Amino acid sequence: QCQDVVQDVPNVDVQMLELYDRMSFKDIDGGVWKQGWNIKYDPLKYNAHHKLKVFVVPHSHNDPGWIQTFEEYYQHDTKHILSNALRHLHDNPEMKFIWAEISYFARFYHDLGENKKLQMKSIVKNGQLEFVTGGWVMPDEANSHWRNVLLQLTEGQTWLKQFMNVTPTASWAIAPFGHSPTMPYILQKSGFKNMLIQRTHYSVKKELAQQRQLEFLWRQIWDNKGDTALFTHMMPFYSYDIPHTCGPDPKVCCQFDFKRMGSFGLSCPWKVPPRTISDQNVAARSDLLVDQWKKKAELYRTNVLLIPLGDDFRFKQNTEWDVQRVNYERLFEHINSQAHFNVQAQFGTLQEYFDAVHQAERAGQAEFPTLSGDFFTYADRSDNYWSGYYTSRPYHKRMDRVLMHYVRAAEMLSAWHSWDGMARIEERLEQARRELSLFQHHDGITGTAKTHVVVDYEQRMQEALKACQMVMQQSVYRLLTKPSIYSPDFSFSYFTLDDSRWPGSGVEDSRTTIILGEDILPSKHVVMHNTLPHWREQLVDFYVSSPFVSVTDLANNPVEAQVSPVWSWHHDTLTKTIHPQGSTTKYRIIFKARVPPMGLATYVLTISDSKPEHTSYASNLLLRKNPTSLPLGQYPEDVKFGDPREISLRVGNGPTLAFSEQGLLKSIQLTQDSPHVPVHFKFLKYGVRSHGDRSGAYLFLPNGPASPVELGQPVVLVTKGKLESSVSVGLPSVVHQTIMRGGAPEIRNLVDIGSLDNTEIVMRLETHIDSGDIFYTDLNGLQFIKRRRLDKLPLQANYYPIPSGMFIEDANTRLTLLTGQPLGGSSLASGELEIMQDRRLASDDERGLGQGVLDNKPVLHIYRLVLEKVNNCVRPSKLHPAGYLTSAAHKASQSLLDPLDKFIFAENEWIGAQGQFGGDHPSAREDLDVSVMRRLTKSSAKTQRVGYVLHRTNLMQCGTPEEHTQKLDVCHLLPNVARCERTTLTFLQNLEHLDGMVAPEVCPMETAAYVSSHSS
C-alpha cells in the first residue's frame, strides 16, 4: 500500500524550511572558528573504558575538468596520484586512501599493465584503497537532472563491479555547491547505507553543530514513514582542506598538513608552519592536535571521530605520501600510548568510520535526529551566496537536457533488438553515456570551468549527440523495415535527425530542408519516435523546399497540416534594428503526429503543383513604424503590415492570450467567458557592485534589484495559423517568442547577451496572484519543494536552482513555468516569478576559477507557461514542505524534456518501409514513466537481460476523471521472458525474484528498477 505523499506532514526533528524561518543568519566573528564559537569540552568525558576513536582518512579531490581539461589533469596530476597511491599502499599495509571519481580511475586502470592491475585489485580487496560513492564524477546537485545523476552513478558503479568486484555503500560529496535530497533518494535505492556532505551554509553548520545535529537520518520531505532515510554526516567547518578538517582552529590544523613546510611551494596563511614530528616535539604537537580533535568531537554524538586528510589533487608526489604518513604515524604512536589522552587514532577509510559509528549507535551510545529539506542556497561566508552557477554558461546547461533525452532515446530504440558487434551500438552508447556523465561534474554543468575546458565539454557532448543519432537512426531503420528486406550498412545514414529546438533557429543553421520537386523527388517519408510509455500527440515541423506539400500517414489517410514561412532574426548593424527576414526558398510544414507508447509512426510529405486540400497557410503580420516589404517566394499569402498595437490570439479551444504593443504577454484568458488574468512578461537587468565583492561564475552579487531593459520600439512579428500561431519580438539581447498550439503556450528566448559586460538578463512574470512570500521550485526534475522568500536574507540568497520548473499559487490560481534547461530563479515579490537567462561577468569571484564569464554564446531557452485554476485541487496542508504539479503542468514539462524525435529518410526510396512500431505497447497512466530502458547484455550472451527504471511522479487530484489506461509490466515488453527481478537502480544487485515474471508498477514519488531475462 502506497504512502500518501500529499496529506500527512512528516514529523521530523529538523525540517529545513522551518529551520530557515526561525534562524537568524547573523554573521558574527566566532573566534579562531570564524563562523562558529569557542568549543569547550570536559577532559573527563573520555577515559579508559570510553576512548575517543579517531579515523584519519587520506583523500585527494580530483576534478574531471576545471582549470584544466579532464585529459590535461589526468596527464599532469591524476595519473601520478594514482600511480603513487598504488606504490605507497602496496608498500605500506597500514596506509589507507579513498577514491571518488571513477572516470579518472577507469582511465588509469585501463592503461595499467597486468601485474599492476593485480596489485591494484589486491589493495582494494584488502581494504587499503576504498571507493567512495563510485560515480563517474561527484556531480553537481543543483542543476543536474536526477536521471543524469543516476546515469553517472551507474556508469561508475558498473565499471567498479566488473573490474574491481566492489560496490560502494558509502558516499562522499565534499565539493558540490550546496546539496540536494535527490542524492539520498537515489543512493538509498542503490544499496547505500551512508553519505557525507560538506558545502552547506555556514549558518546551518553553526546551528546544527550547536544541537549536535550534523549527523542525521535524511528522508524525503514527503516521506511520513521514513523508509527513504539515509544516514548523513555533514562536516562542520568552512572547507574540506586539512586546515578546516582536524578541528575548529585552522591556524593549528594547518600545522598538521605536512605538505606545507616549503619544498612543495605551499605554506600556512596563518603564519605558523608545520614542523617535522620528532621525539622532542611529539608531546606538545600531540597536546595541540588531540585538543582540536576533542573540540571537533563535541560537535557529534558518538565516540568515533572522522578526520579527513586531503585537499585538491593531493598525494601526487612520492615524498608527499611519506611526509604525511610518517609524521602522522609518529603522532599516533605517542597519542595511543599516552593513557591520559584516552584516544585511539589510526588511518581509516570512510566505510570504517561509518561502521564504527553505527556500532556505537547499536550499543545504545547515541540516537540520531531525523531531517528533511535541502541545503540550497549555499553561502561559504558573509553574503557570498552561490546562486550564480544556477545560470552560468546557459548554452551548455541547455545542451545537457538535449543530450539527456538523446541518450535515453538511443538506449531505448536500440534496446528492442540484440545487435551484432559490427554495428558498434554498445560502443557508441558507452561513449555517449560517459560524456553526458562527465558533464554532471560540479564544474561541468555548473558552468564554473575555464573557457578552454568548457570547450572540451562541448566537443565531448557533440560527439555524444552524434553517437546517439547514429544508434537511433540505425534502430529506426531496423524497427520499421520488413525483416526479409532489412539490409543494414552499419556505417550508413538511413535517416537524419531533425531537431527544431537544438541548437535552435538563430543559434546554428543545422536542420536539413526536405528537397522535393516534380523534376527531382515527389515525396519524403519521415518518422516520429515517442520515448514516453503512453500514446502521444504533438505538433511536429519540418523544413520543405515548397509550400505546396501535403501530409499522409502510411494508410494514405490525409493529415491536416499548416505551412508557415521560415523567419530568421537579424541584428541589422546598418538600420540598428533587430528584424525578421523570411526565407524565399524554405518553408515550415507543421502537423499533428500520433505515436504509440515507446514507439514509432511514419508519415509522408508529398509535393503538389498548387495548394493542397488538407494544408493551410498562416497569415503573417509585421508590426512596426516604417515597414519595408517582406517577400516570401512561392508562399501563397502576402505579409501584412501595421503600426505597433496590442493584439490578441486564440488557437483551437485553447487560452486567449493578449499582448502589449511591444509583443509581450499581458493577459491570459482561459475560456470564452472567463477573466483576462493579468500575466505580464518583462525583461530586466542586474548589474555588479562597483566596490566590494564582484559576481563571477559562482557568486550572484547584484547591485540592487533589477532595472527594466529599455525596449525602444521593437519589431513584432505575428504569425496566425489554424494549428499554430505565435508572437515574436526583437528585444535587445533577446528574440522572445510566444507560441500557441491550443494549450499552455511555449516560450522561446534566443538569448544573445552580446558584449554587455557585468550584466545579468532576467525574464520576470508579473501577476496579481496572492502568493505572498511562498513559491515552489524543483530539485533535479524529481520533486517540488516549497520555498519561502526571506527578507532577512539578501536578494541572491532568495535565488534557487530552477532545474525544470517553478510555480506560485494562491487559494484560486496557479502560474507554473516549466523549463527545457536549468537556470536560476526566484519570486522576489508576491505574484512574481523570475528566471535568469544569461550572465556576462568581467571579474573573477575568488573561488579559484581565475576568470570572469566572457564566453557567452547565443542560446535558445525554451519554456511552457501554465496558468490554471487550482481551487478544486487536493493540495498539501499549509505545513507540508512539498508541492505537486497538475496533469497539464507535468505533460508540459515532458514536452520540453522528452519531445517526439523526428527522422528524415535520407535516400530517395525506403524499400520495405512500415507504418508503425509499438501499437501494441501498453499505454500507461500519465504519472508513470519508463525513465530508462537499457539492454544490459551483448549479443553473445545466452541469457539476454534488459534493464528498466520506472518512475511515478505524483499529480494533483483536481476533479478530472482518469482516462482508461493499461497496466504496464516492463518485464513482458520483450518476448520470451524467463525471469523478472527487482534490482537496485544501477541494476547491480538483485533484490526480489518476481512472481509470474510480472513487474509491479510503483507508488507515487517512487522509483524502481527491473531486469527481465530472456531466452536467446
Ligand SMILES: *[C@@H]1O[C@H](CO)[C@@H](O)[C@H](O)[C@H]1NC(C)=O
Ligand atoms: C567478488 O567478491 C565476492 C564477495 O562478495 C567474492 O565472494 C567473489 O569470489 C568475487 N567474485 C569474483 C568473480 O572474483
Ligand SMILES: OC[C@H]1O[C@H](O)[C@@H](O)[C@@H](O)[C@@H]1O
Ligand atoms: O571554490 C570552488 C572550487 O572548490 C574546489 O577547489 C573544487 O571543489 C572545485 O571543483 C570548486 O569549483
Ligand SMILES: [Zn+2]
Ligand atoms: Zn571539485
